[PDB]
Copies of this chain bind each other. A is one copy, B any other.
Amino acid sequence: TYVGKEAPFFKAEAVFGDNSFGEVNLTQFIGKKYVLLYFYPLDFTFVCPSEIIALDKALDAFHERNVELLGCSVDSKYTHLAWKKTPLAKGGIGNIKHTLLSDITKSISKDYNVLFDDSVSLRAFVLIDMNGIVQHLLVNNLAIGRSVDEILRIIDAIQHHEKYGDVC
């Protein structure tokens, strides 16, 4: 429904890669970067966070394509930072360099249609282009993976089509 249309606006408190706190606006990216917004339910769960770290291993691939990677859950910035300071051995995410958003009011998850049970989000990926238009949505109800390779391809394909259209 917001697909092919403007990304709903969000402002949120965040933890940057150097571990300081701050704020991120959707609008600080219009005309400058693509945004890959991804959602996951909760920090410190018993599902191990292979997805998040896989996405961080590929951070440079994302910068090559001019995309800002943003993770987001309803946990507070402090839980996010505490998750970072936790050894991977213990189920932590270690010291990732991409920024994590705190959806502390849950309104961002409401806005993006990914809130479940007025509680936590479902797993989701949203790809927002340089005009703030949503080009791609993926919503998973289950704790399964998503290849970072799959995501890279999608980005390349949309950037390719966004500039040459669609023949073969």
Given the known inter-chain contacts A82-B44, A143-B167, A161-B142, please indicate yes or no for A119 contacting B104, CB distance below 8 A.
yes
Copies in the complex: 10
Q: A91–B106 Cα gap in the complex (Å)?
A: 26
Contact with B along A108-120 (1 / 0, CB 8 A): 0000011111111
- Partner of A1 from the list B48, B50, B79, B116 (CB cut-off 8 Å) is B116
Given the known inter-chain contacts A1-B116, A136-B139, A137-B138, please indicate yes or no for A82 contacting B86, CB distance below 8 A.
yes
| Chain A residues within 8 Å of chain B by Cβ, number | 62
Nearest-neighbour CB distance to chain B for A165, whole angstroms, equals: 8
Residues of B within 8 A of A122 (CB): 1, 3-4
Residues of A within 8 A of B (CB): 1, 3-4, 42-48, 50-51, 74-76, 78-79, 81-83, 85-86, 90-91, 104-107, 113-120, 122, 133-145, 147, 150, 153-154, 157-158, 161-162, 165-168
